[PDB]
Design a protein around this ligand. Sequence first.
Ligand SMILES: OC[C@H]1O[C@H](O[C@H]2[C@@H](O)[C@H](O)[C@@H](CO)O[C@@H]2O)[C@@H](O)[C@@H](O)[C@@H]1O
Ligand SMILES: [Ca+2]
Ligand SMILES: [Ca+2]
Ligand SMILES: [Ca+2]
Length: 132
Amino acid sequence: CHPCPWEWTFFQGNCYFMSNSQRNWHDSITACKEVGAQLVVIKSAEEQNFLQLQSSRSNRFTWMGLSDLNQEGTWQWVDGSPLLPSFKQYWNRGEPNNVGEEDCAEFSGNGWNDDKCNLAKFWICKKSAASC
Ligand SMILES: OC[C@H]1O[C@H](O[C@H]2[C@@H](O)[C@H](O)[C@@H](CO)O[C@@H]2O)[C@@H](O)[C@@H](O)[C@@H]1O
Ligand SMILES: [Ca+2]
Ligand SMILES: [Ca+2]
Ligand SMILES: [Ca+2]
């Protein structure tokens, strides 16, 4: 038994998969479901800080499970949950700007950015860690 699958990362009871290949936003959702997970939905500042740190060091644009596809300007997590006021401090300066229609969120540098959902980027899946 192992709390997390090979190549995954453990943090506060959950396992994260930082992909080494790229996919557009929708295909990233599917990629995570296929491994019993979900395109990362952040539920805490602690989690956000942990993820942001790993992603900035990776120097890779990375998708998260957040979008405003349904209603422009209203960002919602893939778990149907709404983006809380306390998390809006994480957007990069000048973001989200919806330039050229950007409805999917990614980790970019030290914060978040909204980008075109059809662009291929790395992605992070999240699932609960096993105990033993
Ligand atoms: O080129 C830097 C920037 O490019 C992409 O983001 C686009 C857009 O979403 C941004 O708002 C603007 C300004 O930040 O730049 C592009 O037009 C992403 O690859 C992003 O991660 C990157 O920083
Ligand atoms: Ca839109
Ligand atoms: Ca948008
Ligand atoms: Ca943007």
